[PDB]
Write a structure and sequence with these properties.
The structure is a homodimer. Chain A has a six-stranded mixed β-sheet with strand order 3-2-4-1-5-6. Chain A has a single domain, classed as Rossmann fold (3-Layer(aba) Sandwich), CATH 3.40.50.1240. The longest helix of chain A is centred in the C-terminal third of the chain and has 21 residues. In chain A, helix 2 packs parallel to helix 3, helix 4 crosses helix 5 and helix 7 crosses helix 8. Chain A has ten helices and six strands. Chain A is of the alpha/beta class and 240 residues long. At the A-B interface, helix 3 and strand 3 of A face helix 2 and strand 3 of B. Bound molecules: ligand A1E1K (2 copies) and chloride ion (CL). One ligand A1E1K binds next to helix 4 of chain B. Chain A: Pfam families: His_Phos_1 (PF00300). Chain A: One of its GO terms (molecular function) is phosphoglycerate mutase activity. Chain A: It catalyses: (2R)-2-phosphoglycerate = (2R)-3-phosphoglycerate; (2R)-3-phospho-glyceroyl phosphate = (2R)-2,3-bisphosphoglycerate + H(+).
Chain lengths: 240, 239
Amino acid sequence: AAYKLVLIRHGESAWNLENRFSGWYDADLSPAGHEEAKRGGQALRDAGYEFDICFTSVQKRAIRTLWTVLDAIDQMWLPVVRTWRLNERHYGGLTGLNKAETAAKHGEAQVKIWRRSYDVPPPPMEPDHPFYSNISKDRRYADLTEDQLPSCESLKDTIARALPFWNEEIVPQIKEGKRVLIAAHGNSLRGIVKHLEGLSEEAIMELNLPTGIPIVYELDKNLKPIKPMQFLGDEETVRK
Amino acid sequence: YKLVLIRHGESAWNLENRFSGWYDADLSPAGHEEAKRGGQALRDAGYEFDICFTSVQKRAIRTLWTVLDAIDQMWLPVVRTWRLNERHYGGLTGLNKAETAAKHGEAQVKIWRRSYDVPPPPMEPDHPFYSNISKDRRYADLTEDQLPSCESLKDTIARALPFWNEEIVPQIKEGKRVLIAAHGNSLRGIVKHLEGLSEEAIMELNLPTGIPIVYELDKNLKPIKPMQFLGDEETVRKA
Ligand SMILES: O=C1CCn2c(C(=O)O)cc3cc(Cl)cc(c32)N1
Ligand SMILES: O=C1CCn2c(C(=O)O)cc3cc(Cl)cc(c32)N1
Ligand SMILES: [Cl-]
């Protein structure tokens, strides 16, 4: 094909072990998730992949995934571009709650509505929320406009603010011939996969990208996939 | 304005004592610990940055990664440039002191050590690093004039300072707090421009490794006080 694009979703975080909603909270990788990034980078190294530019979020679990990959493939010298538009979905007032706290406060019906819905956001993260200063006042977002800093996101909102970065900054690099690596999160990568394959709301909400595994697209000159996405790795991990 | 430089520490296989140059040596464990200590000094002092500059050489890049991790600023933008690379030591790259004297003689090696504008011999096709460096992907867009076979110190500073002038100075002037993680001779180039040092003075300057180097600059980017070092009092005095 004309072009080849590689995505990687970061693995287990510290808050995953606590089964807390992270969203925009800057949870680090857990030791296991860091090991996953190492395995994915080894897969890219064995396959001989080369890149010219990398994109990631401003969240350290993705940035550390990308760092671990670049180390494994001996491409630490590549230019790296960080953007809040590749961040995980903003889970609003659910941020920091675990499964039990969420069910206790909102009930199983409302939580299932939020889980299955494409465009119903969770509650806003209000100023008295325990992580409100930690996230909404973090200087890394100081240049966002009032309308851009979200208090909460549905998957629709998340995709809506990720796709502008893809169209304006990633697409030109790809069409310039640069080999792109994107290290990011489940829901932002959902936005990209939905755009690439023209998937339905229901189809994207059923797609669970694997973590720590290189996802390869072969793209024609209009950036439309010529075949299904492929996973890199040994036979076992590729199986699962 | 506040500007921080950090020079990386020890590299693998004693290569900092072997004219490591443009060979892309990794940090040794000890040099990695040096970087962790420097980053911890920066965190203890509560430093914040807005943009970071480094070379295309992984010992500098890993030093900067370690510092960003230690100060919880992995989200900062990072700009890599070959213009901040270590001095290219030509045919000497990879040789220890005894091998250098054996091959070239004491008198010649002294001349290269003491001279500001005489390069070592070029790195030839038979050199074990010749294809490893000169055909490396990362230098593919360099023009023939730009990609060295060897550099005098003058050469190194001449190719570093254009990057300083065109990319770092505008950021300092916009008020962004700049961090630079680079190498001995490229940082020498910056320090020589900042302090207007002479050739003999810059050749006598040996910047310490793993130590944050803080500059306070006025509206003209002219230092207002001598460079200061960060760390516990023990290592600060030493430096
Ligand atoms: O990607 C996902 C799936 C996992 N998920 C769950 C769960 O119980 O597994 C609840 C939930 C709620 C919201 Cl608003 C978004 C979610 C949620 N995003
Ligand atoms: O920064 C330096 C100082 C250390 N140095 C020595 C030494 O014996 O310490 C020999 C030498 C030769 C060249 Cl061409 C450049 C050097 C050299 N660059
Ligand atoms: Cl980086």
